Amino acid sequence: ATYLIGDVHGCYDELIALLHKVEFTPGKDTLWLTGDLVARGPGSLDVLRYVKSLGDSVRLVLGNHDLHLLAVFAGISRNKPKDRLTPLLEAPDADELLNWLRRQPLLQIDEEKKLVMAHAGITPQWDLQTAKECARDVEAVLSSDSYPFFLDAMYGDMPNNWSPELRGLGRLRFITNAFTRMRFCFPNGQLDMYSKESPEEAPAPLKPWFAIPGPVAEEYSIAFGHWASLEGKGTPEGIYALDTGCCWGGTLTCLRWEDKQYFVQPSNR
Numbered sequence: 001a002t003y004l005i006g007d008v009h010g011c012y013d014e015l016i017a018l019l020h021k022v023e024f025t026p027g028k029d030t031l032w033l034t035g036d037l038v039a040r041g042p043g044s045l046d047v048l049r050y051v052k053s054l055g056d057s058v059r060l061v062l063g064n065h066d067l068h069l070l071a072v073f074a075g076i077s078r079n080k081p082k083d084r085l086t087p088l089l090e091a092p093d094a095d096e097l098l099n100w101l102r103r104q105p106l107l108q109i110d111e112e113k114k115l116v117m118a119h120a121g122i123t124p125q126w127d128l129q130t131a132k133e134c135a136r137d138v139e140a141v142l143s144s145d146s147y148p149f150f151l152d153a154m155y156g157d158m159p160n161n162w163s164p165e166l167r168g169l170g171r172l173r174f175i176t177n178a179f180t181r182m183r184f185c186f187p188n189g190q191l192d193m194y195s196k197e198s199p200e201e202a203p204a205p206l207k208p209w210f211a212i213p214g215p216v217a218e219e220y221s222i223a224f225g226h227w228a229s230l231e232g233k234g235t236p237e238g239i240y241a242l243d244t245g246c247c248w249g250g251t252l253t254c255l256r257w258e259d260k261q262y263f264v265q266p267s268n269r
């Protein structure tokens with residue numbers, strides 16, 4: 001079977017309990033994770049150890065907190081105490097775990113299932129070919145020896161409008177924001193980088209990225225995490241918002257793809 005789980009945010013106990021609930025069996029089953037594996041929850045170290053050990057039985061996309069962790073590890077950004085990253089950063093296998101983490105994709109595609117995954121979703125300004133190329137470019141810099149220069153460059157809220165003519169720093173920043181920070185769009189599809197609330201309480205003319213028709217969503221189901229204020233509701237057919245806020249005292253959600261059956265694990269704190 002195929003299982004898709006939203007943002008774990010260091011909630012290792014809840015992850016393991018949910019996976020035992022569905023009897024997840026590496027070799028017979030595959031697990032999809034929406035990213036933001038780490039931070040806020042107490043168990044980022046255990047989460048990373050486990051997900052890395054799954055190997056080919058897991059398909060991960062990186063989220064904004066995974067990228068932030070990489071930036072802290074490389075000394076680009078400052079550690080926020082609330083993230084609870086110190087046990088992972090000080091772990092004897094920190095190098096192993098994080099060098100593995102920076103090699104993981106921003107985008108997963110399964111053609112037989114017609115299924116696409118990224119942390120924040122797919123901007124309506126991208127077709128599948130363009131999303132693929134952008135994911136490849138950013139993954140290539142993330143997996144290179146020079147990845148801390150990229151991590152430093154990534155921070156920023158501009159430009160927020162895609163164009164194939166974008167070059168250099170602006171292009172990489174947009175790609176990063178579209179995959180890992182996107183929530184609301186302007187009607188022309190341009191990113192808004194500020195509002196993090198639920199769609200009903202957002203100001204006009206902002207609309208959810210998935211409320212705007214785009215070539216990828218027209219042909220593929222899209223699964224994503226990231227947008228916890230959504231609470232996994234209010235999406236159209238073929239759009240699966242899996243982040244139900246486990247680190248926030250909400251719930252960890254698992255979707256079995258074959259029968260679209262949901263399994264839910266309450267937060268422990």
Ligand SMILES: Nc1ncnc2c1ncn2[C@@H]1O[C@H](COP(=O)(O)OP(=O)(O)O)[C@@H](O)[C@H]1O
Pocket residue numbers: 007036064065196197198226227228229230231245248
């Ligand atoms: N149910 C909710 N309603 C409104 N805001 C929320 C809700 N849940 C989380 N948030 C807020 O959303 C902000 C962004 O957090 P989140 O959606 O989890 O994304 P990320 O993990 O990338 O930081 C947090 O500052 C939190 O306070």
Ligand SMILES: [Mn+2]
Pocket residue numbers: 036063064065119180225226227
């Ligand atoms: Mn996120």
Ligand SMILES: [Mn+2]
Pocket residue numbers: 007009036063065226227243
């Ligand atoms: Mn998150």
